[PDB]
Design a protein around this ligand. Sequence first.
Ligand SMILES: [Cl-]
Ligand SMILES: [Cl-]
Ligand SMILES: [Mg+2]
Ligand SMILES: [Mg+2]
Ligand SMILES: [Mg+2]
Ligand SMILES: [Mg+2]
Ligand SMILES: [Mg+2]
Ligand SMILES: [Mg+2]
Ligand SMILES: [Mg+2]
Ligand SMILES: [Mg+2]
Ligand SMILES: [Mg+2]
Ligand SMILES: [Mg+2]
Ligand SMILES: [Mg+2]
Ligand SMILES: [Mg+2]
Ligand SMILES: [Mg+2]
Ligand SMILES: [Mg+2]
Ligand SMILES: [Mg+2]
Ligand SMILES: [Mg+2]
Ligand SMILES: [Mg+2]
Ligand SMILES: [Mg+2]
Ligand SMILES: [Mg+2]
Ligand SMILES: [Mg+2]
Ligand code: NA
Ligand code: NA
Ligand code: NA
Ligand code: NA
Ligand code: NA
Ligand code: NA
Ligand code: NA
Ligand code: NA
Ligand code: NA
Ligand code: NA
Ligand code: NA
Ligand code: NA
Lengths: 143, 56, 82, 46, 81
Amino acid sequence: TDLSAQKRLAADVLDVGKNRVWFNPERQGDIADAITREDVRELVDEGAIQAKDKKGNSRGRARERQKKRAKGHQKGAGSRKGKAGARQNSKEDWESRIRAQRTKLRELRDEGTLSSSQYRDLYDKAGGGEFDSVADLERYIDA
Amino acid sequence: TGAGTPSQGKKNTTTHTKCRRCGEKSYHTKKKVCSSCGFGKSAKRRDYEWQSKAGE
Amino acid sequence: ERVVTIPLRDARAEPNHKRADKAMILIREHLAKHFSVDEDAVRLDPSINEAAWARGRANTPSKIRVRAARFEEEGEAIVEAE
Amino acid sequence: GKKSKATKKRLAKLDNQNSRVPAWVMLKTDERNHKRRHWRRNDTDE
Amino acid sequence: SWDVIKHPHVTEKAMNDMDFQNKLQFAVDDRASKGEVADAVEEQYDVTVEQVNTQNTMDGEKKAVVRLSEDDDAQEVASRI
RNA sequence: UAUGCCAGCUGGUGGAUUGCUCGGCUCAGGCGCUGAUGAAGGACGUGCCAAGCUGCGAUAAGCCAUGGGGAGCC
RNA sequence: GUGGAAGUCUGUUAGAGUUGGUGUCCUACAAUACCCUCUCGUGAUCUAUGUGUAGGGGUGAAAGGCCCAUCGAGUCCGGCA
RNA sequence: GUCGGGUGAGAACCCCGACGGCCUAAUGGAUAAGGGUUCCUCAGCACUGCUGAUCAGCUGAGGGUUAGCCGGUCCUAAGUC
RNA sequence: AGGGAAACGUGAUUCAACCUGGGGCCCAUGAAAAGACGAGCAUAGUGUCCGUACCGAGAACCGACACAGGUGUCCAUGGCGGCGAAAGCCAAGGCCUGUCGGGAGCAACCAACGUUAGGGAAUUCGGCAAGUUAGUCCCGUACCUUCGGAAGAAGGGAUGCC
RNA sequence: UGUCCCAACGUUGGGCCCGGUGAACUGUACAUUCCAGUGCGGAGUCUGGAGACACCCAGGGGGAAGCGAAGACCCUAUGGA
Ligand SMILES: [Cl-]
Ligand SMILES: [Cl-]
Ligand SMILES: [Mg+2]
Ligand SMILES: [Mg+2]
Ligand SMILES: [Mg+2]
Ligand SMILES: [Mg+2]
Ligand SMILES: [Mg+2]
Ligand SMILES: [Mg+2]
Ligand SMILES: [Mg+2]
Ligand SMILES: [Mg+2]
Ligand SMILES: [Mg+2]
Ligand SMILES: [Mg+2]
Ligand SMILES: [Mg+2]
Ligand SMILES: [Mg+2]
Ligand SMILES: [Mg+2]
Ligand SMILES: [Mg+2]
Ligand SMILES: [Mg+2]
Ligand SMILES: [Mg+2]
Ligand SMILES: [Mg+2]
Ligand SMILES: [Mg+2]
Ligand SMILES: [Mg+2]
Ligand SMILES: [Mg+2]
Ligand code: NA
Ligand code: NA
Ligand code: NA
Ligand code: NA
Ligand code: NA
Ligand code: NA
Ligand code: NA
Ligand code: NA
Ligand code: NA
Ligand code: NA
Ligand code: NA
Ligand code: NA
């Protein structure tokens, strides 16, 4: 018996890779007689032809690691491979910081805490890179 | 790069094809001229005395 | 029938990436000799095969306990893991 | 490649010329196809 | 002058089309258009052609898959020849 | 007396030889243009079964007429 | 601080190239191959397809290099015995 | 690759299962050129296959490619006639 | 509608495709034409002709071969990893056809290659071959210089897990 | 730092034996040679001696001025480019 053709049909009827199709070893004679796609579906309904399960990589160990690192661990000098600028893009970081600082100033102005002149003065200084962070800005604001 | 075998790989270009006028695979589809019968170049049929020995 | 311990130290003589194959041959030759039967007549149950290939083709165990039976009209042995 | 209607006709003919001398012709002639052409070993025209 | 229809194309596949889709298959002259095939077929078998699909075959001939109307029955039209 | 040398015998391999000639080579006499009324050439078709060659051209190894020929032919 | 220039750097990203091993091969896997090493890799960059230039003529960041395994004058047939 | 098993006159290499492996810009998926029937089915082993073969891109015979809305077709490019 | 054995989800982040903006460069200025829009709606009829199989490559292409060579495009967003389209490992998918096997602890010799005490270039035309170093962070960095560079100069320290 | 002193052990693929497949190079003849001599002055074959029972396996290549190529060097030709 030669069931290679049936393997190709079964793969397509089951809509699976040929390598995952299973043919009951005790029914080679019957599968051998399977000539049509309908003959195949029939054997499929009899469980004579089945599809093995596809595996997926476990992300369990990945998640544990992800947790340690989210908590700040496993990132010492001995764990880094890329250059500092590679681990954190400095331009992207500046956009983050300067936007946070501008939004802050923006809220204090509408809120009334800052006159459009103080705001202006602080805004210009922020864009000039005078503040390391929002906190740093807030601190400077309180004289 | 070797001018021999390695340079033979890029040869998938069609040039000479079956000619409408004489039937020979000599109609150069790029030039639209048959190198065998002259179709595309001459109304008269391509032919030369050097195609045979001088006294024949 | 009886339980026998087959030594596979001689599979080390074969190149390492191919022990499993050689081991499987040693097992057949051992049963053939100790049960006075032709190597053609020794049938190894897949269990034995899987045991020898458990750690891949290069890491075969040094021994393997095998249960084998002898009988029939042409003489033979049927063997399995234990 | 993209074949035209005429090219298709020619290849069809070449496939047809690629058949064997019918058995009955052997008996009728009291006893080879010299134009046998394999797709791999041989090359067609055009 | 050449005729449109050459002969019925009868093969396993042509049977399935006839039995399951009410279509008839013919070998026609490769110079014939779908329209010419539709007409020729109606006038020869007294039927109503609903659709014609063509193909220039690797045999050097043209094949036409002619579907008839629900009013006509391919199985019967083909049985008389 | 292995491996083996020389000559022969039986069988083979090979295709020489001799015989044979449906092909060539050369000489001689006769004759001599075809095509837009689409030639020559080529392509693709055409047979009950048809791959090659020949013939033929969707009327496709052929259709018609007259003469010859003759009981066979495809 | 921002910005992100460059015939700029590192880089077997892709891709291009071809220094050493004078290794393997050398009736080859191959009439120019295999492996390791090595150079370039935003530019005068690499590449597909189409297209142009023809033989004392082309083309040449020039080596007499290249113009279909053919080049200090291609190939084919003829002159030609 | 191995152990069982299937078919067969014949099985190390044709097929099934298990176990063990190989490939991750490819040894996967879709295609251009180019090939031209190599595609599918059935029947086979004189030929081809770096061994064998019940297998096959091999041998023989049949079958298979369906479009208003995918391409061509149309436009114009370098340029060609 | 369909599909699924079944459930036949809701939110989020980073976001290829796709859309839409701002800036910079040129002794370089980055096609054309057909066509579409401009220019409504109903109903009906028509929409012919050619291509379509398959391979697309360590056996379907070129290389005389089932040739370790050559041969364009798209998939560049599968998981872990890490700077990464890198390595290594693993999915999906593919394969066991880079297609001859069986046997000998399997000697000499050869191809690739591992490890070699003490010495450490004595080898050699020559350190050829091989080896050493190496990722990242901190410290620190000479001569010279066209002030750009030299520079990762050199040298020193750190590096895991919980 | 196995480049060297100075080599060793090991790993994988061969090599060796077995089944199957199955070429090529090369061949005036003879041929078990060795030491000397001789000879157109570079001899398995001539001369004198010596040695020499036949066949077969594996080896590293001393000889056959080994195989491969009508010498590129040099000269000559009332040669070529
Ligand atoms: Cl298309
Ligand atoms: Cl903006
Ligand atoms: Mg910056
Ligand atoms: Mg050349
Ligand atoms: Mg056929
Ligand atoms: Mg169509
Ligand atoms: Mg650069
Ligand atoms: Mg680089
Ligand atoms: Mg070009
Ligand atoms: Mg010079
Ligand atoms: Mg097939
Ligand atoms: Mg079969
Ligand atoms: Mg298709
Ligand atoms: Mg192969
Ligand atoms: Mg040492
Ligand atoms: Mg020295
Ligand atoms: Mg010295
Ligand atoms: Mg070196
Ligand atoms: Mg003597
Ligand atoms: Mg000479
Ligand atoms: Mg000279
Ligand atoms: Mg001269
Ligand atoms: Na071909
Ligand atoms: Na027909
Ligand atoms: Na005449
Ligand atoms: Na015929
Ligand atoms: Na600045
Ligand atoms: Na190289
Ligand atoms: Na010339
Ligand atoms: Na000549
Ligand atoms: Na095989
Ligand atoms: Na990733
Ligand atoms: Na060593
Ligand atoms: Na020698």
